[PDB]
Every structure is written in structure tokens, then in C-alpha cells.
């Protein structure tokens, strides 16, 4: 939290809408890492719609500038709340109060040159606490080209790939949820369609081995350009009306 604030942090964290604001609250029934339910108060109540309200906590999904959004619960179990009280904690939010950065112990001195005009010298304990460790969620947007000739579906079983890379993929060219891609690893199987090459008098052995150019000549895998490391989060294969993508999704 900001130890030195202006009182505006709570108002911004309650008015921005990034945190879940509890309406008609009261006795809290069940809170886990994804749902919050509240038993309805006896003060105000709809006839027939007394019920409970569901608060689905949004987990780590991709935002616009490659940031993660998370909603940590505030009330654990057994506490009355008010209509207007906060329950979730969004990005840069500490218990329904806006907490953008973090404060540290500052020494005002000239050092041995490591701070020249406005430079910053930090400690190793900040690295030891895993402090401001940024979590960047990027998008893997796969493409399956449709041509005038050939099938349209992108499937599994791509040749010229070692068995060490094929072990981390499931069927139809998708990896398991929790597998780490590091640089040139395969997250999705890119497939060129079987058109444009079946009416070729030449290259019959190439069509027998690595048919219809399933891979490129010399390129990297289609996950991230090289220099990264990290695990997958969520797969969002959305289907078409009458497309037969049951085995992948």
C-alpha cells in the first residue's frame, strides 16, 4: 500500500470498476480463488429473487499492454459486508485501495559514482523478495490459410520434428496447459494445406517424406520470436457453425 497517500486511492480503486463491488451484501456463504457468493441481507430483498449473487473472479487473462489481471478475495469467510464494500483486488490494488508501486528505504547521499545525476542504486534484498517481478502475457494468434485447392483443417503429425518437441504436444497441435515454451519450442502446429502440390510431376519423394510443405525451409516455430521463456496459460480455440473441431476443443 502507499504509506504516504492523499485519500484518493480508495476512491479511485472503488470508482474505476477494476475491483468487484459488493451489492446488497451481508452474510458471505462461500469464497474460493474463482467465485464469491453472498447470502442476501434481510434489509433489502426482492420477492422471489432473494437468492445469492455470483462473483466470478477473473483469472490471468491477456490485457492490452501485455499485462495480467487478477482478483484476490478480501473477505475469507463469515463477515457481514455493506452494499458498496469491496471484495476483489485488481491489478495494483491493496484491499480495495489503489497501490501503484511500492516504497523502500532511501539513503540521500552521493555514492561512488553509481548515481551520476538521477541514476538509481538498488539492493540485492529487493531481488531476493521477488519484488516488482513483471508478468507479461502475450498472444499466440494462430492462422490456418484456406486456398483454392486442398483441405482446410490444420491437424497434428507434422514431420521433420524431433521427438523431444513432440512429447509436449497433445492431439491436433496444441500443448498441455502448464508446459513451458522456451524460444524455438512448438506451441501450435502450423500447417500448410495439401493444395498447390498434388499436381506436380516432380518432387515425389519430398511429397512422400515431408508432403505438401508441412514445414518451412529454415524458420523458427510459431510460438514467440526467440529470446523468451515461460509457460502457457489458456487456450481459446473457438469454432465455426459446422466445422468439426471436437478433438481439439
Amino acid at each position: 500500500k502507499p504509506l504516504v497517500g492523499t485519500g484518493m486511492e480508495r476512491a479511485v480503486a472503488v470508482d474505476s470498476g477494476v475491483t468487484a463491488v459488493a451489492k446488497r451484501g451481508g452474510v458471505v456463504q462461500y469464497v474460493d480463488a474463482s467465485r464469491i457468493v453472498i447470502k442476501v441481507n434481510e434489509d433489502e430483498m426482492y420477492p422471489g429473487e432473494a437468492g445469492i449473487d455470483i462473483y466470478n473472479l477473473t483469472k490471468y487473462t491477456r490485457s492490452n499492454q501485455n499485462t495480467c489481471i487478477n482478483q484476490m478475495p478480501c473477505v475469507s469467510l463469515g463477515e457481514p459486508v455493506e452494499r458498496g464494500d469491496v471484495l476483489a483486488d485488481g491489478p495494483s490494488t491493496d484491499l480495495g485501495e489503489l497501490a501503484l508501486g511500492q516504497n523502500m528505504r532511501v539513503a540521500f547521499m552521493p555514492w561512488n559514482g553509481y548515481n551520476f545525476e538521477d541514476s538509481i542504486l538498488v539492493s540485492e534484498r529487493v531481488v531476493q523478495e521477488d519484488r516488482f517481478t513483471t508478468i507479461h502475457i502475450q498472444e499466440l494468434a494462430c492462422v490456418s490459410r484456406d486456398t483454392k485447392l486442398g483441405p482446410e483443417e490444420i491437424t497434428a503429425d507434422i514431420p521433420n520434428v524431433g521427438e523431444a518437441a513432440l512429447s509436449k504436444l497433445d492431439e491436433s497441435g496444441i500443448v498441455y496447459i502448464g508446459a513451458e515454451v522456451t524460444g524455438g519450442d512448438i506451441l501450435v502446429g502450423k500447417v500448410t494445406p495439401k493444395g498447390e502440390t498434388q499436381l506436380t510431376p516432380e518432387e515425389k519423394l519430398l511429397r512422400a517424406i515431408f508432403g505438401e510443405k508441412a514445414s518451412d525451409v529454415k524458420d523458427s516455430s510459431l510460438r514467440v520470436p526467440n529470446g523468451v521463456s515461460g509457460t502457457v496459460i489458456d487456450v481459446q480455440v473457438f469454432t465455426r457453425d459446422g466445422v468439426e473441431k471436437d478433438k481439439r476443443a
Partner: protein, 50 residues
């Protein structure tokens, strides 16, 4: 500490000397005012889609 059922866990020591009458607004009246003027229907023929 009985304002919004969350200040009781964390008391902020306020240094505001001058008195406050008007409270803090919703901070989204500018974004929602034209939306609640355009969508909500007015039987009087002014300021809307009607």
C-alpha cells in the same frame, strides 16, 4: 470506520484541515452521462435519439 465496511481494517490518518461538504463523485459521470441521455427515452422532444 463505519463508512464502507473496509476502513475499519485500515485506518488512514487524514491531515485535511479545511472542511469538506461535497463528497467524492463517481468519477465516471462524463462517460455515462451521454450514454444515459442517448439510450434512455424522453417523451419530451429534446436531448435524445427521440
Amino acid at each position: 470506520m463505519v463508512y464502507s465496511y473496509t476502513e475499519k481494517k485500515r485506518i488512514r490518518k487524514d491531515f485535511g484541515k479545511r472542511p469538506q461538504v461535497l463528497d467524492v463523485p463517481y468519477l465516471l459521470s462524463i462517460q455515462l452521462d451521454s450514454f444515459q441521455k442517448f439510450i434512455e427515452q424522453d417523451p419530451e422532444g429534446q436531448y435524445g435519439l427521440e
